[PDB]
Curated annotation (Swiss-Prot):
<feature type="domain" description="UBA 1">
    <location>
        <begin position="23"/>
        <end position="67"/>
    </location>
</feature>
<comment type="function">
    <text>Non-catalytic component of the KPC complex, a E3 ubiquitin-protein ligase complex that mediates polyubiquitination of target proteins, such as CDKN1B and NFKB1. The KPC complex catalyzes polyubiquitination and proteasome-mediated degradation of CDKN1B during G1 phase of the cell cycle. The KPC complex also acts as a key regulator of the NF-kappa-B signaling by promoting maturation of the NFKB1 component of NF-kappa-B by catalyzing ubiquitination of the NFKB1 p105 precursor.</text>
</comment>
<comment type="subunit">
    <text>Component of the KPC complex composed of RNF123/KPC1 and UBAC1/KPC2. Interacts (via ubiquitin-like domain) with RNF123. Interacts (via ubiquitin-like and UBA domains) with the proteasome via its N-terminal domain.</text>
</comment>
<protein>
    <recommendedName>
        <fullName>Ubiquitin-associated domain-containing protein 1</fullName>
    </recommendedName>
</protein>
Length: 83
């Protein structure tokens, strides 16, 4: 018998082939926005979020999810119309 005791491991991940292109400064990215706006998010948010997510299509998503229920986000009301 031979082994440690205090912990050992508890993590697993992998990222085979994962490269695109980043866009910093200047107006927001549309290519990315499209993705979001294509999913089911408002340009405003997507845009804002993006800017906060270094213009990330995936990242933003989460931010959009987490912020999905954020006040700052500022959202209108939902009357009768558009149900």
């Amino acid at each position: 018998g031979s082994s440690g005791s205090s912990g050992d491991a508890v993590e697993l991940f992998k990222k085979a082939n994962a490269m695109l292109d980043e866009d910093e400064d200047e107006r927001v990215d549309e290519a990315a926005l499209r993705q979001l706006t294509e999913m089911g998010f408002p340009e405003n948010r997507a845009t804002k979020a993006l800017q906060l997510n270094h213009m990330s299509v995936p990242q933003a998503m989460e931010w959009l999810i987490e912020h999905a229920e954020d006040p700052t986000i500022d959202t209108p009301l939902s009357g009768p119309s558009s149900g």
